[PDB]
Amino acid sequence: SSTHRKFGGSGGSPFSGSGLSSIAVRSGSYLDAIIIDGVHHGGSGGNLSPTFTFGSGEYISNMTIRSGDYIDNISFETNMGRRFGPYGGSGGSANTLSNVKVIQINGSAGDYLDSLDIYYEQY
Numbered sequence: 001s002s003t004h005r006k007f008g009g010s011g012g013s014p015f016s017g018s019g020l021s022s023i024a025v026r027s028g029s030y031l032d033a034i035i036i037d038g039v040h041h042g043g044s045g046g047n048l049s050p051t052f053t054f055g056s057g058e059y060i061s062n063m064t065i066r067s068g069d070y071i072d073n074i075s076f077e078t079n080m081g082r083r084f085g086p087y088g089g090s091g092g093s094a095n096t097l098s099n100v101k102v103i104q105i106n107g108s109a110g111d112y113l114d115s116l117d118i119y120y121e122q123y
């Protein structure tokens with residue numbers, strides 16, 4: 001079994017992540033875009049982060065999202081102890097997925113990343 005949780009506001013066009021082989025973001029004050037398996041969701045503002053490429057057997061085990069009307073910030077840790085971020089600003093409020101396995105990242109995006117809808121197993 002698994003579950004999901006949504007973060008952020010009501011704007012943007014919905015998207016579905018197509019896998020969890022790599023993640024990058026564009027960010028400034030907010031998350032301008034999330035780039036999942038090379039596929040860009042969001043706008044062209046901000047600056048491009050390095051790409052995080054998951055190794056064999058590697059998955060997101062902890063993730064913190066700051067959000068308000070948009071996604072402000074993302075950070076994550078993997079089951080191999082590697083970290084991504086934080087990227088973004090210090091606005092919004094923080095919520096965390098703790099001791100999980102992320103299986104799919106969906107969301108909604110326009111000029112910014114408005115929302116994330118994270119599907120995961122809770123351990």
Ligand SMILES: OC[C@H]1O[C@H](OC[C@H]2O[C@H](OC[C@H]3O[C@H](O)[C@@H](O)[C@@H](O[C@H]4O[C@H](CO)[C@@H](O)[C@H](O)[C@@H]4O[C@H]4O[C@H](CO)[C@@H](O)[C@H](O)[C@@H]4O[C@H]4O[C@H](CO)[C@@H](O)[C@H](O)[C@@H]4O)[C@@H]3O)[C@@H](O)[C@@H](O[C@H]3O[C@H](CO)[C@@H](O)[C@H](O)[C@@H]3O[C@H]3O[C@H](CO)[C@@H](O)[C@H](O)[C@@H]3O)[C@@H]2O)[C@@H](O)[C@@H](O)[C@@H]1O
Nearest residue numbers: 011012043044045067068069070071091092109110111112
């Ligand atoms: O970057 C790509 C582009 O960048 C450019 O910048 C243009 C960018 O500009 C315009 O928006 C910027 C900015 O303008 C105003 O100041 C506000 O509208 C502002 O929005 C805030 O304030 C309004 C008014 O209160 C709220 O309704 C908003 O929800 C938002 O509110 C948060 O932030 C406020 C300021 O801090 C706080 O007071 C609020 O309390 C609230 O704060 C909460 O949330 C924060 C974020 O999570 C958090 O930090 C806080 O702690 C707190 O929790 C706005 O950002 C604008 O032109 C915009 O365009 C969009 O709207 C137009 C007109 O309707 C559309 O034509 C356009 O397609 C855009 O809409 C799409 O994108 C939206 C975002 O993804 C999406 O929601 C929407 O559905 C559409 O898909 C724009 O992108 C330019 O240089 C440009 O060239 C460019 O391409």
